[PDB]
Amino acid sequence: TTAAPLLALLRENQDSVKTYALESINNVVDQLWSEISNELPDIEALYDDDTFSDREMAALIASKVYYNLGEYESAVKYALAAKDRFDIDEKSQFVETIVSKSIEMYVQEASKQYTKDEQFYTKDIIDPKLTSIFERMIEKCLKASELKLALGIALEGYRLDIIESALKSKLDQDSTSENVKIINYLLTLAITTVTNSKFRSSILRKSFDFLMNMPNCDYLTLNKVVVNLNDAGLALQLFKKLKEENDEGLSAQIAFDLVSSASQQLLEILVTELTAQGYDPALL
Amino acid sequence: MFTYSQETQHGNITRGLAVGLALINYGRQELADDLITKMLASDESLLRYGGAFTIALAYAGTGNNSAVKRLLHVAVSDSNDDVRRAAVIALGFVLLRDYTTVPRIVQLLSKSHNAHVRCGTAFALGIACAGKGLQSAIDVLD
Amino acid sequence: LTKSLSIAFENGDYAACEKLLPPIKIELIKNNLLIPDLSIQNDIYLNDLMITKRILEVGALASIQTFNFDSFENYFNQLKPYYFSNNHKLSESDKKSKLISLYLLNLLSQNNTTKFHSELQYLDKHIKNLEDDSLLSYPIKLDRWLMEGSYQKAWDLLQSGSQNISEFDSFTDILKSAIRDEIAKNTELSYDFLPLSNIKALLFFNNEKETEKFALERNWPIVNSKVYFNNQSKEKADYEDEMMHEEDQKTNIIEKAMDYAISIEN
Amino acid sequence: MTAAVTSSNIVLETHESGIKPYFEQKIQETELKIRSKTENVRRLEAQRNAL
Amino acid sequence: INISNNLQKALTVKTNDELMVIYISNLVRSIIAFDDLIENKIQNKKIQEQ
Amino acid sequence: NNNSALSNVNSDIYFKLKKLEKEYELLTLQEDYIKDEQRHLKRELKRAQE
Amino acid sequence: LHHSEKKYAEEDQVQELLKVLNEISKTTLTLDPRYIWRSLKDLSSLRNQELLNAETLCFTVNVLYPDSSSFKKNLLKFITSNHKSSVPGSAELRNSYPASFYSVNTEKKTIEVTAEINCFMHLLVQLFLWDSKELEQLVEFNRKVVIPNLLCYYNLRSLNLINAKLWFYIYLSHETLARSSEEINSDNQNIILRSTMMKFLKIASLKHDNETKAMLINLILRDFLNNGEVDSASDFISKLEYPHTDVSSSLEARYFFYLSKINAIQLDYSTANEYIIAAIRKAPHNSKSLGFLQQSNKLHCCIQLLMGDIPELSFFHQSNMQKSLLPYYHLTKAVKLGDLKKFTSTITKYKQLLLKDDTYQLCVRLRSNVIKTGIRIISLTYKKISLRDICLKLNLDSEQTVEYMVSRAIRDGVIEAKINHEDGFIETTELLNIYDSEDPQQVFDERIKFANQLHDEYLVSMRYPEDKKTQQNEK
Amino acid sequence: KMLMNLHKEQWQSGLKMYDYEEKEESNLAATKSMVKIAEQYSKRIEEEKELTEEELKTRYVGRQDPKKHLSETADETLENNIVSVLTAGVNSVAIK
Questions:
Q1: Residue in H12, H10, H5, H28 with CA at minimum distance from that of residue H80
Q2: Which residues from chain D sit within 8 angstroms of residue A143, using beta carbons?
Q3: Tell me, what DSSP letter sits at residue B27?
Q4: Cβ(A109)–Cβ(A130) under 8 Å?
Q5: Mutation choice for F interface testing from D14, D28, D48, D49 by most F CBs within 10 A
Q6: Which residues pair with G428 in a beta bridge?
Q7: Which chain F residues contact residue B63 at CB under 8 A?
Q8: In this complex, do A31 and G236 lie within 8 Å of one another by their Cβ atoms?
């Protein structure tokens, strides 16, 4: 009824006793949380010591009580101190409480560090334990087979690498139409949300590359990349793919959108360039 | 152009440069911030007239909170008629793609006791919902 | 074995029981595992209830009769909250009467009256028409007297509790010191100066050496056998002004008007 | 369409449900923020129009 | 500050008058809204009728 | 009957509704603006009476 | 017979079903849908008693049941089985509903509306139990079914609002059974019940529903105090998670009453009194609120007596609740007149009364207050008085006795004096001059601050109905 | 800057305090005034249960509306006295 008998065990010394005492609390740690909040410093001391095999447990009690109090900020330190037993949370609607705050924290923290230096994924600026918990949510979204989730979360926290793995696995041309549609959602998304200049640029040039790899794709979607970033080199590249096809009418359609859309100074470069590669005068 | 606007003593010429400076910064975002600052900070009404449209073309088709707040702040705070009119026109270029929310924001400036402000209200809504329509503006403009 | 703690009480050396508390604790884990600890109950666990009940209570009284500080405070702190909520439906013991008595005296020794009354309400439920006051009158009367301000009475009451001595004496010492301290807090505000002869009586000293030492710790000077409350009372006053809390707590008058203005303008 | 007496998409929805609360949580904070923000925006406009 | 204390309370009275006049206004808008929803039926019925 | 679609919700949060959470900060910016406008027109009341 | 009453009663249940359906399917406005549903329950409890009792089974078969019909039949046997004109083909249709659609949409499979049929089914159940006054098996049966179901959903805010009101009844039947029958089983499942409430309360943080949080807080605070542990209840409240968005006149009155009871027995009566005054204040004044008011009054007198300040005679006199406040009236008189022996008699004569209501523990500390109140009157009436005269007035033995009592009493500051055992008299220290202190600016500042609080509360409240109302259709 | 500015005797006015006979007098006048037009206010909000907005303004007043006149005067003297205590408490601390 009262967990005060179990509290009594914490304060009592002998390791073999404490060993029992953490396991007792842990059974009823999810189920009781205002009968045990007075001995949270004793518990934190056990985690701080490394004469326990029970450091992982100790830290887990501490965290479960602390979110229920309101202290999601304190709680999460203890999350990554426990280092295991959040496998359950993911498959539990019931608790995914300690997961929520970890992902949130990651997005605020990592966006600060992207501006400073792009890399932080393999450097020590964001810890490898902070990183690995983030990537666990990507694994759950591709399990659940909705890719618009994983492309969104990665764009929040300023991750280039996740985008690169996520799009590589969708690519297999399981449907031609669906690869492209996925790509158009990331495009619309990046335009609007992302206010970091470098990051929006990286992801838009990247989408041109992915689209182009397919041999069956819309070239109207490929053309959207061109105009947004406004690069002549991209435009050169696109028609060189249709030099290889040797399809003028194809090229003529792409050009009509592009001549309308594109900045005139960009376009002046583009023709001179395509004259230098040699081309048929109708496209020019 | 910037220096020449101080040098001139004819207001048409000052207006023409101040406008001419917005057109150079077409689409230049937060790299045009330096110009805006120097331009609204100077004491001429002409510079403030065009510096409103420097905001408008630098951050077109992007709803930045800096761009938006600054255009609104000057419309209330700067009591002269040119400066009042310009900054209301300038909002719909910033929120060209967010044309739906504009009727609410200049709802308050449509009702204004200042004639100039209402003149500018009417142009902004015209420009904003020109190619992608919207019912709300047609009603505001009646 | 688990019998070896029990036979230690019956040798009448409770120091030995204490020394067997770590080595048997490790074995008592196997027995604590057997019993759900009042999470569920079954007649299975009634048989195990008897095994757990007896071990906890003989070490609980033992701890007390060992008058060394660690042996009294720590070990009884552990055993105490355990036994009355291990047992079924919030406690059915044979020693239940004695142990609740010890429960309340121990609260008082830690000197928190807040803790006493909090518990009194929880005990109340299981004595309502089912024990009431029998020997459990003793700690409620002590607390009542210190609230009523009958420090005369409280003193006689602790002493006559050693006419039925069994471990009442381990609680009597802490509370003799305590009584002196409560008076010292009341009698700051009740004198500007009072004689040596009048204070001696109040704090229940039998001799001069006991009287003068308690006066010095409270920074009350004794001159020509007169003890002065003016020294502590002035001293405390300056230490408050030295510290920072007091600009906002008092509220500065200039700041009050600023708040008046800006509410209207908001 | 969907049923517990047909396909649920062979209990995908259970797993999904487990990673739902982080996604929802921030939208419920935003829900409560809209209720206040809205009311303040039109409160000021009434007051603005009257002066 | 006693004179100010009272003056701040004497404006709560002014505000309190407004709150009630708006909760009355809202009450009339409710009645208006129901009356129209009834009236659409009468105009629907008039076309079938004639 | 029974069941729905839980992917229909999850999809809308990252896509459409993220854009709209940002849009709700642009109406919040409106609030700060008309806080000054409302005070500015109090100053203009003083001047029209004088 | 059979066909007559059940069909008639069924007509109202159909109309009721749609009231819930239409608000939630178009998304709630929070406070407004909520209120309607409360009005709905006033009607349902009456109808459930009236016109047999198989009105619901007749209905259960009409609506899409997934398995709900099994649980119904078991409720029914206890109050005598009925089952004719509640079978298929004489109570079944799957048409006349937009709540279950037409037959063709059920067949083809479509989206769940079986959630709201279920929640609403569970309403009729919770209702059934209270109205008949069923005890024993039915308490276990209902609880064990209903709660797994509420977690087989997707934990939607629309469905949280409705099912939150189900929690009150789940809790009532558990306590009733526990009070009637003293048994090991009831002790055992109480640990399950606290556990469950905390579990839901976490879920409803995530999903941010303020009603589910307000109701779950009040039930479990009440439970801890019935078993008498202060400490668990106190620890819980100082996490400061009570909502104020969806809360009600009753709901906030209830919270405050818990706050009173905790802080008084923790020996701080200023902080306890703050809450109880708030509790009476929120609550309506009716013959249906009678219970709540009645208990609030009882607690109030004693909290006040513990300070050493006395309630007025008009309180009790003009009460319609005065013949239960008669031990409490004598508490007032006995403390005030300072007589040791009246007090002794009062709590012995009225011991069963005081102990029934749980107020007997605070009456023990009121023993102290007899002395304390009597010494106070004496400080008011006499400024200089010998130690001797005081000992005769309260009937005390020694000079020494009075001097221990008085000092402690002015540690608290109740009496407002200082002892002079240098000349053998007690001197009263109250000398006023409070408008000549610096404190009055500070006294006005708190009042000013309360008037600013109403100024905010007026402005923000006013506009909140008005957004919706300008959007509402009008001629 | 030349027009707006009024020398170093512009800031001078803002730390000056005045005869308290005139301050106490100012307070009483305003105070008394709000009793008298607040009997007019009592009449107004006793009634006002009858339709036609214009008709309300003739009958129970709404032309030189009592609620409105009181509110302005109440605010005016309330603002003065916030100033009077601020400017006083400033000088007390500042100069000594």
A1: H28
A2: 15
A3: T
A4: yes
A5: D48
A6: G417
A7: 22-23, 26
A8: no
